[PDB]
Amino acid sequence: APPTLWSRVTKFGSGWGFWVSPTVFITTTHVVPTGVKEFFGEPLSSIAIHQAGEFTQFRFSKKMRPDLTGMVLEEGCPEGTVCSVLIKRDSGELLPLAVRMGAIASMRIQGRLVHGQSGMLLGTIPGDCGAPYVHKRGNDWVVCGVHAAATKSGNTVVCAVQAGEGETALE
Amino acid sequence: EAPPTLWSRVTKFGSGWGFWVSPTVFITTTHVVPTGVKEFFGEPLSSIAIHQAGEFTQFRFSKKMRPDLTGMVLEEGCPEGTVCSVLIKRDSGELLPLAVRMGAIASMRIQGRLVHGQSGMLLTLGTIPGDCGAPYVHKRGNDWVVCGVHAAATKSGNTVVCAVQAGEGETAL
């Protein structure tokens, strides 16, 4: 993972967010500041906000990170593949966690049913919410979720995904 | 070509930045250091070993602060005529590595403050106010080393000065 990729990982509210491009920022809904009128110094009327369950996307009118190129945002992580949760700790330490992704479905997070995807850690803390789930496709990195939750057991984590509707079916 | 953990050493500090040289050693430039405080990174000042002169400030903490890190060598000044990189972090999160050819070491007074400084020329944007403390580094073999911290810049834009930790081989005849 290149430094640029990590530079997209940004402290935000009670957790983290991720610059997908110069104008697009994704994060986990429950970490988003609630009493505010600006994000990153931009008034809400300047920002297109799409929230689906625990997945929140901001598109700013202004180029917030013109140093960045856009990258692909997938609708969920590829089931069965190893992704990395790009965790930054408060000391500055980089803690990428490898995770084997499982099924996409509805899960109860923060007392609400939301589209999510479980994964097995190959640990995280509450402050890690918003950290991106990414994987490499070709020579490029792709982002597919943002950290939402974990079992007390610790071994399983859940990311919120942009669109999970009907990804797994009863047989 | 600087790896992510090398960037992870660059840390927001006071009105600028600092750099973890090792799990216990943090360097920065003096004028950006917060004043009238009782601790840094949760550690009481009284527990910190401090070596500070000519705008170069070094802290050694009494416990491991960044145990995830390997210890790097801190050189006394950059190698003259060689090309180093300033690892600039901007508040936006942007990384701006700047190539710079290092030149003369000299003691000097810039805006009233004594600087044990080394001039360099940017090879080409540039540095800006708020960048002080950013590390100057280069490679010795397969290892990275750090040789100074960003202190000042010339109006012409293209020359910068880092504070270095050098002995009195920088005082005029």
**For residues A51-75, b (16+ Cβ closer than 10 Å) or e, as one string?**
ebbbbbbbebeeebbebbeebebbe
DSSP letter at A7 equals H
The three-state secondary structure class of A75 is coil
Q: Range(s) for CATH 2.40.10.10 in chain B?
A: 1-71, 73-173
Yes or no: say if B160 and B119 are a contact pair by the CB < 8 Å rule.
yes
Of the residues A77, A83, A115, A129, which is catalytic?
Answer: A129
Please give the angle made by the CA atoms of A14, A17 and A20, to the nearest 5 degrees. 170
Task: Give the gap in angstroms from C-alpha A64 to the nearest C-alpha of chain B.
Answer: 8
Which CATH class name applies to A72-171? Answer: mainly beta
Cross-chain CB nearest to B94 (options A65, A91, A94): A65
Is residue B132 part of the annotated active site? The answer reads: yes
Structure tokens at A130: 């918003």
- Chain B residues in contact with A25 by the CB 8 A cut-off are none
Structure tokens at B21: 């040289």
Phi, psi dihedral angles at B106 (to 5 degrees)? -155, 145
Yes or no: say if A15 and A31 are a contact pair by the CB < 8 Å rule.
yes
Return d(Cα A79, Cα B2) in angstroms, integer: 32
What is the H or E stretch that residue A6 is in?
helix A3-7
Q: Which of B7, B19, B137 to mutate to test the interface with A (most CBs of A within 10 A)?
A: B7
Fold held by B73-173: Thrombin, subunit H (2.40.10)
Which residues are bridge partners to A157 per DSSP? Answer: A119, A150
Residue with the two structure tokens 């609400």: A112
Return d(Cα A65, Cα A87) in angstroms, integer: 20
Way the structure was solved:
X-ray
Return d(Cα B164, Cα B81) in angstroms, integer: 16
Structure tokens at B124: 């080409």
Q: Amino acid identity of B103?
A: G
Phi, psi dihedral angles at B88 (to 5 degrees)? -85, 130
Which CATH class name applies to B1-71? Answer: mainly beta
Q: Range(s) for CATH 2.40.10.10 in chain A?
A: 1-70, 72-171
Return d(Cα A132, Cα A148) in angstroms, integer: 10
A164 CB contacts (<8 Å, ≥6 apart)?
A75, A76, A104, A105, A106, A115, A116, A117
Return d(Cα B28, Cα B55) in angstroms, integer: 8
Residue with the two structure tokens 């403390």: B133
Which CATH class name applies to A1-70? Answer: mainly beta
Is residue B55 part of the annotated active site? The answer reads: yes
In angstroms and rounded to an integer, the radius of gyration of the C-alpha atoms of chain A is 15
Which residues are bridge partners to A135 per DSSP? Answer: A142
Closest residue of chain A to B7, computed from CA coordinates = A3
Interchain contact B23–A (C-beta under 8 A): no
Which residues are bridge partners to A96 per DSSP? Answer: A86
